[PDB]
């Protein structure tokens, strides 16, 4: 039979007073009793999180902006498990509608670039504040907020400045909130790491290829969020999900070109030039490498030791070199066979032109 691997029990009481009796063995037609709201479900981590939540019948509310980017989430669950609402952070009624009936709220909202309508502050701080005030008004039992690694109030990068300010306003409005700090997430259809390393015509670094981080698999971060959702041990805590081994970007590019059997191109041109090129390429409409990203190219990961880790969740991550094969083999060309000498005399016995 199937099993509820996410739950420790079947009768679960929330911190708001709701009694949740799990129904079934743990399959598609099963129900945990829980309702959730994942605010960045359309995206990279959010898709995996909603899949893991709706596999067992957690009613996921998905707030969405583009009708077409969300459709792949409806497959993750049975009828009535995944529910869609149209949302904009410039509409408070939307956020209240999204968080009204939920026991778990997850803010995965964040951009790595600034747009005409949303600067880094407007998305990372003010949006977080709006969602957090909704979460406080409706007394939601659990609020789980994702803030990028190396977040710090005053920092060189505006991304980390705004993420730290968000991680402050969340904690000040919602004291029972959990803050999860993921490191650079890699995986399939990743945003800026492996697919980019393997498809890009040329990589660039204002620094050397020398920023150091512990990268982590997106599925394990999603699993950790799943465990944080149902573990009421984790209120008012901070998590630093960073992964087993340390790497530089040069090490990861060497790995990528050893897996890929093709020479990844990198340039290493200076900062004042690349930053201006990036600042110029923000004028096109599609996403490009932002100037604050080449600012972050000089900011290696500083792990907070006071923050919790994976092992508090009884999770052991994978690390990049064992999964790089699985992730990069689609871009492997596989040019030809090995040493076709010793093929001549066996090939001589077959018919090659039929008479």
């Amino acid at each position: 039979m199937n099993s509820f691997e996410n739950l420790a029990q079947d009768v679960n009481i929330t911190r708001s007073g709701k009694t949740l009796i799990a129904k079934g063995t743990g399959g598609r037609s099963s129900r945990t009793g829980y309702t959730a709201t994942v605010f960045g479900a359309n995206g990279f981590l959010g898709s995996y999180l909603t899949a893991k939540l709706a596999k067992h019948g957690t009613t996921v509310v998905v707030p969405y902006r583009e009708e077409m980017a969300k459709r792949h989430l409806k497959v993750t669950g049975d009828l009535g498990v995944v529910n869609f609402l149209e949302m904009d952070l410039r509409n408070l009624e939307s956020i209240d509608e999204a968080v009204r009936h939920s026991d778990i709220v997850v803010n995965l909202i964040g951009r790595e670039y600034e747009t005409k309508n949303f600067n880094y502050y407007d998305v990372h701080v003010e949006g977080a504040r709006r969602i957090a005030e909704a979460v406080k008004k409706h007394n939601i039992a659990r609020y789980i907020h994702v803030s990028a690694f190396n977040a710090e109030i005053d920092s060189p990068s505006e991304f980390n400045h705004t993420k730290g300010l968000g991680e402050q306003v969340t904690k000040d409005i919602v004291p029972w909130a959990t803050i999860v700090r993921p490191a650079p997430m890699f995986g399939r259809e990743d945003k800026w790491f492996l697919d980019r390393m393997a498809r890009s015509p040329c990589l660039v670094s204002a620094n050397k290829f020398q920023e150091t981080s512990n990268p982590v698999h997106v599925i394990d971060v999603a699993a950790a969020l799943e465990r944080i959702c149902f573990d009421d041990s984790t209120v008012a805590q901070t998590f630093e999900l960073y992964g087993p081994q340390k790497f530089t970007q040069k090490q990861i590019i060497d790995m990528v070109s050893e897996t890929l059997r093709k020479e990844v191109r990198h340039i290493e041109l200076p900062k004042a030039l690349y930053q201006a090129y990036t600042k110029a390429t923000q004028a096109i409409w599609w996403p490009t490498y932002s100037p604050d990203q080449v600012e972050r190219q000089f900011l290696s990961q500083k792990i907070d030791p006071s923050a919790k880790t994976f092992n508090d969740l009884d999770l052991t991550p994978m690390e990049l070199p064992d999964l790089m094969f699985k992730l990069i083999r689609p871009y492997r060309v596989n040019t030809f066979q090995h040493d076709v000498s010793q093929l001549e005399n066996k090939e001589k016995t077959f018919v090659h032109i039929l008479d």
Binding site: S3, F4, E5, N6, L7, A8, Q9, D10, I219, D220, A223, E226, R227, L313, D314, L315, F325, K326, R329
Partner: protein, 123 residues
């Protein structure tokens, strides 16, 4: 006539355990020799040693069977599966039914004692 496929074997029920012994060992040899093909055809995310470990596990599952006819049926179905795997008839979805261990850990709470199962209503 209707001719057989590539790696077909006519169904012939041994009247002896000593002949079926040789037949089973040959089939084991063929699976082991074909495991690289199983890793190339099906885009497998794990070792060829892992495939051979799984083959050995599935051959050990029926190691202490002594009824001859049951062993004959098991040999016939094993050869069916070999023909289905070596000839690319299965897809990755059906081939990876044998490999649930290689997929990532299914959640946190996997009971192995009584109180766990009780709290989860599996006792």
């Amino acid at each position: 006539a209707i001719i057989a496929t590539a790696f077909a074997e006519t169904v012939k029920f041994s009247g002896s355990k000593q002949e079926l012994q040789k037949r089973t060992l040959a089939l084991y040899r063929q699976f082991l020799r074909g495991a690289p093909t199983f890793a190339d055809l099906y885009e497998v995310q794990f070792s060829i040693p892992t495939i051979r470990t799984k083959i050995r596990q599935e051959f050990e599952r029926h190691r202490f069977v002594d009824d001859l006819s049951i062993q004959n049926v098991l040999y016939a179905k094993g050869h069916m599966e070999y023909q289905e795997c070596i000839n690319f008839w299965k897809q990755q979805a059906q081939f990876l039914k044998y490999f649930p261990e290689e997929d990532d850990i299914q959640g946190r709470h996997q009971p192995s004692n009584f109180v766990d199962k009780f709290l989860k209503n599996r006792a």
